[PDB]
Structure 1
Amino acid sequence: MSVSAFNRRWAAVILEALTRHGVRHICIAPGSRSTPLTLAAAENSAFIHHTHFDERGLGHLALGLAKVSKQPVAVIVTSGTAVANLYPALIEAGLTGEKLILLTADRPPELIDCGANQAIRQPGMFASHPTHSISLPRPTQDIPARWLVSTIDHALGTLHAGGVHINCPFAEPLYGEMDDTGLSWQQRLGDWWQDDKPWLREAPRLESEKQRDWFFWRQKRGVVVAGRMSAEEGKKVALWAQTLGWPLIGDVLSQTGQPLPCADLWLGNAKATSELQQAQIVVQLGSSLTGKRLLQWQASCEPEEYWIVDDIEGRLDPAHHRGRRLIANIADWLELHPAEKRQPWCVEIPRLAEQAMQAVIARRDAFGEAQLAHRICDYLPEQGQLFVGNSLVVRLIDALSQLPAGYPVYSNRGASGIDGLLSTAAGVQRASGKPTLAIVGDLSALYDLNALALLRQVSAPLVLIVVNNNGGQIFSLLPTPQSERERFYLMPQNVHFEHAAAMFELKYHRPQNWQELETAFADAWRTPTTTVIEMVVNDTDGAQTLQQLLAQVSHL
């Protein structure tokens, strides 16, 4: 009888199904057409609910929650451009593996392509970027609940990584009293409603087999490259490489402790690349390598075999080496391919790395973004986590700092967009409840400015450092043409962030020197709130300091 009531019962099956696959967090944006999903979610006690008004920011909030928690995170939006705004976060999830379940409300079929308000063609609108796409039919009791739950269960159960687009059409009426319409339809699932398992259990595991010739290859001269992995995996990789006697090139994203720090500098020295030419195998664990010199060495090296171990699917070597692409949990993979103690084979590179770090330390005093990057270890919150933005900051920390082994680092380095960094950081914080240091550039902060609304709600202190060098100064590091550089690349916006902080009642500091910065941090970690720290630096100093250190270390 009641369409409004059946809509809600149809939606309740969808939401309850998700709880059987570890969905705990659900992020919801406002709308009318999404009513059946949103009310089902609100009524379901299994969920932690997050809200936001900008669906692009909502998608990145969900991304951050998923990134840290390692469980699927659901999103509810209404029909129309609300759905399109989820694209950036979905694309990033497709590259780095976050499980985002996008529940996108839709008009019913009879209201598509007829000029109806807020009605667009939604099935397939994210093309190949979701791992799975479900285009649900117009709700009807003539399709059994067991079909609906089974379709959800197949999508979630078989999900190795990445997003799922579930398009959910609903016809009006959407509002009205809840009657018994659809109760017997639901009850056909019997005591599944009281169960904690999926209706259909379909959970194949995707994993490469052990490499049986590892105990041959581990005897050879090898290099370990560590990219993005978990904080615990970083510690395990550091011990493993040390035991192998192989040099470990550790990315800022690796949490290995970077025992040969400043690789972006010393990989520029001919003595280093000459010694690495002796490598017969490279075993890379993790991916999304940060530094230019590392990417260039990776592209140029010619070991007999190149292996990449990661739980991400697909090719991960942009230089297309002869070798192996091994899909595995990194910690599990290390157990299956253990190290045996062996004399180290590198003799020159440890010296060069020490010399490289000494060159950076010699330049630590100037109050600039290169020095902030170098020193950032001194400002990490205890038992906290770091969220590192894109553009210069991730490159500077990677090149100039040595981050502690096992200290959690998070980032958006799949597609490396500057469009969702504040909202992602908010999700990273909420997921773990840890004190968080997030560092972003000024254009990045402007891009996601309204995410400061989300940052009014954190469970532990969050410090947002905005490095304001007046534009995208990565384009002062790149050899962009001088005539067009300011207008068409740097795009200085000539703003500060004190009023932004004030709008959202966030504490704000603009430290002028190292002492003021240390005071600002000591202030900030005291309460479970977000503090904005704006570091104003001269436009090109960071880029130029990196360039100078590169040159200096190359001549060592």
Structure 2
Amino acid sequence: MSVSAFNRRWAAVILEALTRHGVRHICIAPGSRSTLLTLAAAENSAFIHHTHFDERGLGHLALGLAKVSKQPVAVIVTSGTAVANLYPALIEAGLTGEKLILLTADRPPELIDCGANQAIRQPGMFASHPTHSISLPRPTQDIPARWLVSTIDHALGTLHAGGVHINCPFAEPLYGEMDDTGLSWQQRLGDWWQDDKPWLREAPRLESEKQRDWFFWRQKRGVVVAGRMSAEEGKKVALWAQTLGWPLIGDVLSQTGQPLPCADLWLGNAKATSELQQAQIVVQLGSSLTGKRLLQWQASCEPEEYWIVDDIEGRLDPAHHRGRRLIANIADWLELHPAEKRQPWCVEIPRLAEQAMQAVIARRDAFGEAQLAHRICDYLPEQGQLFVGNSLVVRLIDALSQLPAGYPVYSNRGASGIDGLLSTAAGVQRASGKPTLAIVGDLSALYDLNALALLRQVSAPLVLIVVNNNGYLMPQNVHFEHAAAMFELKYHRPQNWQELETAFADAWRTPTTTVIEMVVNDTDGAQTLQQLLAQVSHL
């Protein structure tokens, strides 16, 4: 008899199944036609719950949680444009491999395309961006609970990386009658209910094989380029390159400690370019390289072979070198392709690197963007993590700073959207519980302004540094003092290093967010970068 009693049990089966695939965190924007999913989510003790009222920011919240935990993270939303607001964070996940399980409630098929409310076409809404899309059928008991959990297990089990869109229509009414309808339908799953594992286990691994000619290649003149990877991988890559005797170019996202710092500067030197032309093979581990000089060099170098090792699939070399694209966990890969001690073949590079760091240091003082970027590793929280936006300021950290090996760095450098940086940082901080430094420009802060609601609720101190270069009535110069106030966050606008170091100490005390607004020019940082680059090009 009861359609709502049945709808609840369909929904509970879908949630129970996610539970068998590592889904722990779940993000929900409340709204009264996803009711069944939200409701099955609350009954389910397995989930840690997060909410936000802006579905765009909710996607990014989920994206941040996945990015740090390396587990799949679910998102439930109600039917209509709620769903479309998930696209950005979905897109970013498809590039960087976050597993976002989007459960989008939908009207039933009889209510689509007929003037009904909050009703749009949701199946295939995200085109090729999900790794898998499941458009679930209208709930009925005539489809066995084993089909339903098997379809979900198929999608999650085969999922190497990226998001999955599960569209979930529900018959109206979403409320009412409250009986045993669909009770024996659930009971056919038997003791899968007290189990632990998927109903259907489908989990093939996608992995490249051991390169049998590694023992030759490892004795040639190689270079290691280290892109985005985990904190732990960065230290491993640092050891492996050092053992090989190969120059390591490490990105801000690599956490290698950057043994050859200020690459963005020293790749400008003709002495450095000439040593590198002698390179017979380049082994690039990780991807999304940050620096202009590194991107130019990569694009123009001509080693016999060019290798990209990364756990994401597809082509990762925008200059299309002849070589290899190797799919792997970077740490397993280094295991499979171990180093033997060999004397370094580079003689000039390690000098130029030192000299470049000395040049930046002769410049540490003017209270600006480039200098904050240079000194950033002085303000990093102890046992913390850094989240870094899509701004000049982070190319400047990459160019002018030397971050410590193994210190966690996170970002959104898939498509480098500037639309979700605060909600992302909020997910990054929640997943790990660590105190967090997030560095962002003013447009990114204005873009995701309402994620300040999210940042109120951090589990450790979070410092949001907003680098502000600004950025009918005369245009105004916006600031973030009232924004902070509006959300009961701490706020500082330091004028000098003493005030910044002070602002940082007060910030690192309680668990909430302190906004530190650093007003700067729209030219000093760029300008300082160029000066150091010419200086180094000459050295």
Match of 2:98, SS state, is coil
Note closer, same or farther for the CA distance 1:177–1:458 as it changes in structure 2 (3 Å cut).
farther
Post-superposition Cα deviations, 1:263-311, rounded to whole Å, max 9, x if no partner, equal 0111011111111000000000000000010010000000000000000
Take 2:476 and 2:180, find their aligned partners in 1: how far apart are those partners?
A: 58
Deviations 1:444-498 (A, max 9, x none): 000000000001101110000000011xxxxxxxxxxxxxxxxxx9998620000
Give, in angstroms, the shift of residue 177 of structure 1: 4.9
Change beyond 3 A, Cα 1:493–1:106: farther
1:329 aligns with 2:329: yes
**Distance in 1 (alpha carbons) for counterparts of 2:46 and 2:339:** 43
- Would the alpha carbon gap of residues 66 and 490 (structure 1) be closer, same or farther in structure 2, given more than 3 Å must change? farther
- Give distance in 1, aligned partners of 2:229 and 2:499: 34
Deviations 1:502-521 (A, max 9, x none): 00000111111000000110
1-structure distance, mates of 2:333, 2:466: 38
With over 3 angstroms needed to count, the CA separation of the structure-2 counterparts of 1:492 and 1:330, relative to structure 1, is farther
Rate the CA distance shift 1:492–1:42 in 2: closer, same or farther, 3 A. farther
Please report how far the alpha carbon of residue 553 of structure 1 lies from its aligned counterpart in structure 2 after TM superposition: 1.1
Q: CA offset at residue 144 of structure 1?
A: 0.5
**Matched position secondary structure for 1:65:** helix
- Pair 525,238 (structure 1): closer, same or farther in 2 beyond 3 Å: same
Offset, 1:547: 1.4
DSSP 3-state at the match of 1:173: coil
Measured in 2, the distance between the counterparts of 1:214 and 1:336 equals 9
* Counterpart-to-counterpart distance in 2, 1:154 and 1:305: 37
**Deviation per residue, 1:30-71 (Å, 9 max, x gap):** 211101110000110000000000000000000000000000
> Which residue of structure 1 aligns with residue 122 of structure 2?
122
Question: C-alpha offsets along residues 515-542 of structure 1, whole Å, 9 cap, x if unaligned?
Answer: 0000110001111111111011122111
Unaligned runs of at least 5 residues, structure 2: none
Whole-angstrom distance in 2 between the partners of 1:537 and 1:492: 18
Per the TM alignment, residue 239 of structure 1 is displaced from its structure 2 partner at its CA by 0.3
3-state DSSP of counterpart to 2:123 = coil
**CA-to-aligned-CA distance 1:157-195 (integer Å, 9 cap, x gap):** 000000000000012110125321111000000101110
**Deviation of residue 543 (structure 1)?**
1.2
SS at match of 1:253: coil
Deviates more, 1:305-314 or 1:531-540: 531-540
TM-fit CA distance, 1:391 = 2.0
SS of the equivalent of 2:335 reads: helix
Q: Give ranges in structure 1 of 5+ residues lacking alignment.
A: 471-488
Q: 2:45 is matched with which residue?
A: 45
Post-superposition offset of 1:548 = 1.3
Aligned to 1:426: 426
With 169-178 and 422-431 compared, the bigger mean Cα shift is at 169-178
Question: In the aligned structure 2, how far is the partner of 1:417 from the partner of 1:111?
Answer: 34
Between stretches 388-397 and 154-163, larger displacement belongs to 388-397
SS in 1 for 2:143: coil
Partners of 1:121 and 1:165 in 2: how far apart?
14
The structure-2 alpha-carbon separation of the partners of 1:250 and 1:491, relative to structure 1 and needing over 3 Å to count, comes to farther
- Contact 2:311/2:330 (<8 A) preserved: yes
Decide which moves more: 232-241 or 530-539.
530-539
2:324 is paired with a residue of what secondary structure?
strand
Residue 5 of structure 1: CA displacement?
Answer: 1.3
Aligned equivalents of 2:530 and 2:95: distance in 1?
Answer: 30
Give me the whole-angstrom Cα distance separating, in 1, the residues matched to 2:526 and 2:485.
Answer: 31
Question: Are the structure 2 counterparts of residues 102 and 289 from structure 1 closer, same or farther at C-alpha, using a change threshold of 3 Å?
Answer: same
Residue in 2 that maps onto 1:165? 165
Against the structure 1 CA distance between its residues 251 and 493, is the aligned structure 2 distance closer, same or farther, given a 3 Å change threshold?
A: farther
Q: Distance in 2 between matches of 1:25 and 1:362?
A: 47
- C-alpha distance in 2 between matches for 1:43 and 1:112: 29
Distance in 1 (CA, whole Å) between partners of 2:261 and 2:469 is: 26
- Are 2:2 and 2:177, in contact at CA under 8 Å, matched by a contact in 1? no
Tell me the residue number matched to 2:136.
136
Matching residue of 1:499: 482
CA deviations 1:113-135 (Å, max 9, x no partner) are 11111100000010000000000
**1:101-152 Cα shifts (integer Å, max 9, x gaps):** 0000001110111111110000001000000000000000010100000000
Residue identity over aligned pairs, in percent, reads 100
The change in CA–CA distance for 1:491 and 1:322 in structure 2 (over 3 A counts) is farther
Query: Relative to 1, partners in 2 of residues 1:393 and 1:493: Cα closer, same or farther, differing over 3 Å?
Result: farther
Structure 1 residues 297, 15: CA separation in 2 closer, same or farther (over 3 Å shift)? Answer: same
State the Cα distance separating 1:4 from its structure 2 match. Answer: 1.1
Please give the alpha-carbon distance, in whole angstroms, between the structure 2 residues aligned to 1:30 and 1:392: 36
Aligned-pair CA distance for 1:550: 1.3
Q: Which moved more, 1:350-359 or 1:125-134?
A: 350-359
Query: How has the CA–CA distance of structure 1 residues 318 and 224 changed in structure 2, closer, same or farther, with 3 Å as cutoff?
Result: same
Match of 1:490, SS state, is coil
- SS of 2:121's equivalent in the other structure is coil
Q: Tell me the distance in 1 between the aligned counterparts of 2:243 and 2:393.
A: 32
Q: TM-score, normalised by structure 1?
A: 0.96
Q: Indicate how the Cα distance of structure 1 residues 290 and 492 shifts in structure 2: closer, same or farther if over 3 A, else same.
A: farther
1-structure distance, mates of 2:373, 2:257: 15
- 2 CA distance for matches of 1:543 and 1:4? 60
Q: Is the 8 Å Cα contact of residues 244 and 342 (structure 2) preserved in structure 1?
A: yes
Partner of 1:515: 498
Cα 1:437/1:113, change in 2 over 3 Å: same
Give the Cα separation in 2 of the matches to 1:59 and 1:72: 13
Other structure's SS at 2:133 match: strand
Where in structure 2 are the equivalents of 1:398-547 lying within 5 Å?
A: 398-470=398-470, 494-547=477-530
Aligned equivalents of 2:92, 2:512: Cα separation in 1? 27
Structure 1 CA distance for aligned equivalents of residues 494 and 135 of structure 2: 52
Give the secondary structure class of the aligned counterpart of 1:167. strand
Counterparts in 2 of 1:534 and 1:164: CA distance versus 1, 3 Å:
same
Calculate the TM-score normalised by the size of structure 2: 0.99
CA distance in 2, matches of 1:366, 1:283: 38
Separation in structure 2 between the aligned mates of residue 63 and residue 241 of structure 1, nearest angstrom: 31
The 1:222–1:491 alpha-carbon spacing in structure 2 relative to 1, beyond 3 Å, is farther
Distance in 1 of aligned mates of 2:374 and 2:176: 60
* Alpha-carbon spacing, 1:198–1:326, altered in 2? closer, same or farther (3 Å): same
CA distance in 2, matches of 1:524, 1:152: 44
Q: More displaced, 167-176 or 274-283? A: 167-176
Deviation at residue 555 of structure 1 after TM alignment:
1.5
